[PDB]
A paper describes a structure:
Thioredoxins (Trxs) participate in dithiol/disulfide exchange reactions that effect structural and functional changes in target proteins via reversible change in the redox state of selected cysteine (Cys) residues. Based on phylogenetics, protein structure, and molecular mechanism, two groups of NTRs are recognized: (i) Bacteria, plants, lower eukaryotes, and archaea contain low-molecular weight (LMW)-NTRs of about 35 kDa with a non-covalently bound flavin adenine dinucleotide (FAD) cofactor. These enzymes accept reducing equivalents from NADPH and transfer them to a redox-active disulfide motif (CxxC) that subsequently reduces Trx to its sulfhydryl form in a dithiol–disulfide exchange reaction. Thereby, according to the protein sequence comparison, MmNTR is classified as a canonical LMW-NTR.
Protein crystals of MmNTR were obtained, and the X-ray structure was solved and refined to a resolution of 2.6 Å. The X-ray structure shows that MmNTR is a homodimer, in agreement with the gel filtration data, with a structural organization that is analogous to other LMW-NTRs. Monomers consist of two Rossmann-fold domains that functionally correspond to FAD- and NADPH-binding domains. The redox motif CxxC (residues 132–136) is located on helix- α3 within the NADPH domain, with the two Cys forming a disulfide bridge in the crystal. Remarkably, no electron density of FAD or any other molecule was found at the presumed cofactor-binding pocket. The MmNTR structure thus represents the apo-form of the flavoprotein. The largest structural variations were found in a region next to the FAD-binding pocket, the so-called FAD-loop, which encompasses residues Ile37 through Pro55 (in red), that lacks a defined electron density in the apo-structure and is, therefore, omitted from the final MmNTR model. The NADPH-binding domain is positioned in an orientation with respect to the FAD-binding domain that exposes the NADPH-binding site to the bulk solvent and approaches the CxxC motif over the re-face of the isoalloxazine ring of the presumed flavin cofactor. This arrangement corresponds to the flavin-oxidizing (FO) conformation of NTRs that allows for the interaction of the disulfide bridge of the CxxC motif with the isoalloxazine ring of the flavin in a conformation competent for the reduction of the disulfide. By contrast, the FAD-binding domains slide up to the dimer interface of MmNTR with the consequent loss of α-helix contacts. Subsequently, the two domains in MmNTR are differently positioned each to the other with respect to canonical NTRs. This modification is likely a consequence of the loss of FAD, which results in the structural destabilization of the region comprising residues 36 to 68 that disrupts the dimer interface.
Numbering used by the authors:
A (entry chain C): 2 to 37, 64 to 208, 210 to 307
B (entry chain A): 2 to 36, 56 to 307
The structure:
Amino acid sequence: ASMYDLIIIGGGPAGLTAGIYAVRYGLDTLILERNEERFRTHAQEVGVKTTITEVLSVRSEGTKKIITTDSGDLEAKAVIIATGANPKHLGVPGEKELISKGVSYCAICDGPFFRNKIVAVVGGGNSAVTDALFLSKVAQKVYLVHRRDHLKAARVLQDRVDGTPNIELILNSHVLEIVGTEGIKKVEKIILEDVNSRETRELSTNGVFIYVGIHPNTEFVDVEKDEGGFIKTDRWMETSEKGIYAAGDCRDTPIWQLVTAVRDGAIAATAAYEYIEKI
Amino acid sequence: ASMYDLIIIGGGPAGLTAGIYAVRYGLDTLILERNSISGLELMERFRTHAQEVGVKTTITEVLSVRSEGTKKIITTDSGDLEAKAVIIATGANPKHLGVPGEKELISKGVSYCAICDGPFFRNKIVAVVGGGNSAVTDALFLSKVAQKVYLVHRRDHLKAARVLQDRVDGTPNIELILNSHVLEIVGTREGIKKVEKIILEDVNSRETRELSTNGVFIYVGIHPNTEFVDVEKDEGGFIKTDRWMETSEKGIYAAGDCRDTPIWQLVTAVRDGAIAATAAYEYIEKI
């Protein structure tokens, strides 16, 4: 093979939707997935080709796109970036180890588990503060920990945080380690350090929620992006390089706007179709 | 018992999510029911997941909701219900044209989502009824795959943004038909039952015109199912809320499309339901 009409990078909701549409449009398409819902099986049924590999780079020459993977170079007329995004990590001991065992990056998903429990939120932006306020509705107490001398969130949210009794705001503080229990292995405490006095502090917590930014997986593409790595596109998901599109969390969308992976995927596939049938 | 902690009106994604969360919060909750576009069975999963969780569902019709000292009275055709908190999750539906053949040919050529049905109308003829950003955007969308697109609007000009109108201007395979009103959608007499034609009428000259079309996409507004509640709304009838999904009535919340919401996507609906349940929980405990 080697040559294809369309190559979709990412096997998330955006990519899978793009693949299904493209196949129904009758395009020769391949999805590149880094590792293995129903969506997946559903896609396979439609007749999507998927290959477990990793993309290292993507270059465009003469109306052709060169995708270099560990398996070898691949060629395509059009490309869809659907690589999503990941939460930025604290990079401290116990974070990766206690994930799904007290450490989390979604406060709304784990709300009920921490009812009447003690909880810590790390971050200073609207996300950290919003979810600290959220968790305060259900948790006994919430520690909001930030490394700077002030919060970066909007004044309106900061005022609400001051308002709430059961939120304790700890500024000028950075996390040294998340320590867990004696089975079951779950979060038990966190060690803090004052950024100025180097003084240590131990806080008993049942959970730790981390909100220190989001990282879009777009380092391998050289299209136009915003300050943060999110790919800029038009209403048809087209990037700054004609023939290349982007869909899902890896794309540059306004804050108020939440996930629209399926819509982005659907549109990206038909915009690509229009592009292919013209070349 | 006629008394509950929380009552959720609507068994959609938002309501079912709210119910699941609420049960996990340990509240006595009941759902009132009447009776993802990639094509999947995810709605039933919510119900099963729900049943397993332990949420209560009853089939009934709600007529009104009034507050009487932090107590919420839900009056149904079956009788009055009592609750400490209420969540409105009744969703919304696209407005219909109200012409012959529309209801009969739904899922057989008539649709309200062009993005959902894109691949089916590849190399086919298509008609879009409407004049707003949605109708024009989806007309442009369909022109990328369809042979021909009729963009039909009843007014003398389009209400959509200029950038979208300029695009519609060429784009050779879109024909813009203004001052035009749909009289009927007619289906095939022979063969598989599908849309075959649409009858148009010029609003000014009363001249009629037949158009052969394989599909009709309708965009003439969205209707939130919120006439049975007397909380604060916009001219839409969309229920106004704060960040925590709370309505103008303390103790009453709203989630999903029935609410005044930036996005109508499923994830948002689930998110609204989750948040609404925890906001209600906080309200119930505090009092």
